[PDB]
Amino acid sequence: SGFRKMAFPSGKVEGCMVQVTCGTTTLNGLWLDDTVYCPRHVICTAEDMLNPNYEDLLIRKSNHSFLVQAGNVQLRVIGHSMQNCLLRLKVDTSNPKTPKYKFVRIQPGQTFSVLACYNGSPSGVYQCAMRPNHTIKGSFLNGSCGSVGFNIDYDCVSFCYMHHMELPTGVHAGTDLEGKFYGPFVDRQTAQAAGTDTTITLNVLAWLYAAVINGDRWFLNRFTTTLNDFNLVAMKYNYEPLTQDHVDILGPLSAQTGIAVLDMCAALKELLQNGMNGRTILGSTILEDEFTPFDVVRQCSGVTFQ
Amino acid sequence: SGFRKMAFPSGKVEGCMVQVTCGTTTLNGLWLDDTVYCPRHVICTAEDMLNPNYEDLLIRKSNHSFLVQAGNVQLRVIGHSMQNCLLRLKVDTSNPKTPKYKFVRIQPGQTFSVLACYNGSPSGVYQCAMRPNHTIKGSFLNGSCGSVGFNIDYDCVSFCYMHHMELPTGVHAGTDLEGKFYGPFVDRQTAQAAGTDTTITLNVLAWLYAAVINGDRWFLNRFTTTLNDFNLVAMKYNYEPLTQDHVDILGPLSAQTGIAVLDMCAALKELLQNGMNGRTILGSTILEDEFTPFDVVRQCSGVTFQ
Ligand SMILES: *C(=O)c1ccc(N(C)C)cc1
Ligand SMILES: *C(=O)c1ccc(N(C)C)cc1
Numbered sequence: 031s032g033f034r035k036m037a038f039p040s041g042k043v044e045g046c047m048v049q050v051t052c053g054t055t056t057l058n059g060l061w062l063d064d065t066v067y068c069p070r071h072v073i074c075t076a077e078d079m080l081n082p083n084y085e086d087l088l089i090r091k092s093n094h095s096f097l098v099q100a101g102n103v104q105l106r107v108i109g110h111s112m113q114n115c116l117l118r119l120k121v122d123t124s125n126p127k128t129p130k131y132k133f134v135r136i137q138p139g140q141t142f143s144v145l146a147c148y149n150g151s152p153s154g155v156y157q158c159a160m161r162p163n164h165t166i167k168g169s170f171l172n173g174s175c176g177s178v179g180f181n182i183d184y185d186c187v188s189f190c191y192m193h194h195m196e197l198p199t200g201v202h203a204g205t206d207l208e209g210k211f212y213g214p215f216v217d218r219q220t221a222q223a224a225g226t227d228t229t230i231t232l233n234v235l236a237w238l239y240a241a242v243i244n245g246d247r248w249f250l251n252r253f254t255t256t257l258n259d260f261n262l263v264a265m266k267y268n269y270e271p272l273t274q275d276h277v278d279i280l281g282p283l284s285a286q287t288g289i290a291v292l293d294m295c296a297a298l299k300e301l302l303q304n305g306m307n308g309r310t311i312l313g314s315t316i317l318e319d320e321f322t323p324f325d326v327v328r329q330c331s332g333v334t335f336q
Numbered sequence: 337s338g339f340r341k342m343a344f345p346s347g348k349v350e351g352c353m354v355q356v357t358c359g360t361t362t363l364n365g366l367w368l369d370d371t372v373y374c375p376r377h378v379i380c381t382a383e384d385m386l387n388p389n390y391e392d393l394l395i396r397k398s399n400h401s402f403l404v405q406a407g408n409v410q411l412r413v414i415g416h417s418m419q420n421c422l423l424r425l426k427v428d429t430s431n432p433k434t435p436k437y438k439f440v441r442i443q444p445g446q447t448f449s450v451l452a453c454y455n456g457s458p459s460g461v462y463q464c465a466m467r468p469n470h471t472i473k474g475s476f477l478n479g480s481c482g483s484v485g486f487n488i489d490y491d492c493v494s495f496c497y498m499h500h501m502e503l504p505t506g507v508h509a510g511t512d513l514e515g516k517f518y519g520p521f522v523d524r525q526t527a528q529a530a531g532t533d534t535t536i537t538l539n540v541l542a543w544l545y546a547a548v549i550n551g552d553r554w555f556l557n558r559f560t561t562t563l564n565d566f567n568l569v570a571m572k573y574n575y576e577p578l579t580q581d582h583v584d585i586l587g588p589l590s591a592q593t594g595i596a597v598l599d600m601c602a603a604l605k606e607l608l609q610n611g612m613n614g615r616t617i618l619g620s621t622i623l624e625d626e627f628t629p630f631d632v633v634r635q636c637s638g639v640t641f642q
Contacts, residue, residue, distance in 0.1 A: 031475075031476070031502055031506035032473065032474045032476055032507075032508070033475055034460075034462045034473075034474065035341065035462060036452070036460035036461065036462050036475060037343060037460065037461045037462065038460065038461070039347070039458040039459070039460070040345045040346050040347055040461065041345070041347025041348075041350040041351070041458075042347075044345050044347040045347070145345060152345040152347075153345070154342035154343065154344065154345070154635070155342065155343045155344070155346065155461060156340045156341060156342050156343065167338065167340075168338045168340065169337075169338030169339055169340040169342060169635060170337070170338055171637055196337055200337035200338060200550075201338075202338070313473065315621060316621055329460070329475060
């Protein structure tokens with residue numbers, strides 16, 4: 031029993047974290063095989079930052095412009111190239127700690143673990159959901175550029191996020207491991223701001239199913255709803271529309287609990303309209319949207335507490 | 337910016353997790369140097385469980401009663417002994433992945449990271465607070481016996497918790513690494529239940545200081561309070577008494593923010609009496625008590641956003 035924001039064990043990623051310095055700017059990089067990945071930010075100074083031309087900044091660098099340190103060992107850079115908003119630095123040594131891995135671009139509403147790092151040294155680990163508005167509610171200080179997000183599937187580390195910057199409201203933005211930003215954001219100092227966010231309906235529903243698997247039915251009701259009537263309520267409360275694809279994704283959780291998706295939708299509609307009446311669901315006073323259907327299957331028993 | 341329940345990176349602990357089997361019972365153990373630690377539960381079957389005499393159960397075992405597996409490698413047991421509620425199994429091989437480490441008994445209100453494990457294989461990591469009533473709000477399924485809790489200080493892994501069992505309300509109980517239970521609990525199937533809990537006043541206060549360091553003052557007021565008058569309100573709302581020792585612990589956070597402890601106490605008293613008026617503090621709709629003063633200093637900037 032229990033239900034917690036649970037990160038993946040971070041060890042396979044810790045063995046990949048290095049420090050990268052160019053001039054006076056230091057940040058974190060990711061060492062896989064004979065390549066180190068890091069934000070292209072590393073070639074900027076504070077004065078470069080309002081209007082940097084990375085192409086023009088980069089051509090002025092040599093391999094030995096870059097200092098890469100894995101603990102006490104210096105890794106010699108023997109090639110560099112820019113790919114979107116990241117640099118790929120080729121180094122003389124292949125990381126013996128490289129795990130089996132993949133690069134994936136995650137979709138909004140999906141979750142991943144973040145290994146917050148400073149000066150190449152891992153410091154903390156927590157789970158994030160990719161918001162609909164392409165930001166994450168992270169916890170990052172100066173020096174955290176190049177901290178990575180990942181999921182782990184069996185042997186294999188799926189890398190999905192490299193951290194870049196903090197937006198005016200204190201949420202965080204970054205890129206996949208091809209260096210393409212999540213969202214409309216750019217690695218420049220501008221007035222850019224996160225767009226209006228929305229609640230991730232499919233996750234809230236997954237989390238209601240979690241509650242039932244764990245033994246709680248207080249919020250269910252005798253009603254059902256159509257997809258359409260549900261979505262009218264969703265629009266009023268700033269929840270994403272429910273789609274048939276999402277209903278289909280909820281199939282296994284519905285089958286384990288014996289509650290039809292559209293019946294759970296009715297329960298949610300009631301919760302939105304009437305509130306929770308001073309009660310909790312899985313320890314929470316609010317409706318939680320930071321767990322995917324997969325996160326629920328991962329963490330909950332396969333046997334419902336009936 | 338940001339503020340999250342942040343676990344320590346779990347890698348130094350993952351390299352210590354093994355599987356231990358005796359008869360048909362399997363669970364997790366902790367391999368440090370040439371010793372494996374695990375719950376003494378491993379020598380019980382379901383029928384042993386209502387009234388087990390561990391002394392009597394253990395004397396019937398030999399070293400080769402115990403199967404210890406670190407991945408694909410069998411570790412041969414060459415000695416065993418019982419210490420309170422754990423077994424210490426001496427093995428033929430010293431763990432080459434042993435980190436620098438210490439065993440510590442944590443105090444109620446303190447926090448630690450939990451590496452949830454199954455069959456010797458780490459599966460997730462999250463932060464827990466030791467409740468005043470000596471339980472943790474974990475997330476554990478069958479097979480999680482022997483999952484460990486730890487903090488990391490510089491080089492050094494401070495082990496503080498080995499998981500044993502789940503109580504009737506779904507919260508969790510276990511021991512330090514000397515095998516002594518946190519709380520009045522016993523490793524038997526009885527009607528035992530967690531005692532009445534209380535809110536950890538010192539942590540709530542630390543978390544209010546976190547909010548100010550991160551730039552938010554909405555909940556402050558023009559009032560002060562005496563320790564006594566505060567504690568009368570605390571008693572009404574089931575919060576721990578504030579003590580001068582705790583006020584002293586808050587010294588650094590008070591100095592960084594320029595808010596006197598007893599002035600922050602007044603703000604808390606107002607929040608308790610009047611509620612939060614539909615607002616949030618660090619993203620939360622409720623007063624959070626699962627972060628210590630140390631956790632706040634660890635995660636927040638040393639510079640207040642004034
Ligand atoms: C670190 O990688 C990084 C990247 C971008 C920015 N800004 C665009 C301000 C800051 C730090
Ligand atoms: C696993 O270590 C463990 C320990 C104790 C119990 N009970 C006392 C039921 C169960 C599992």
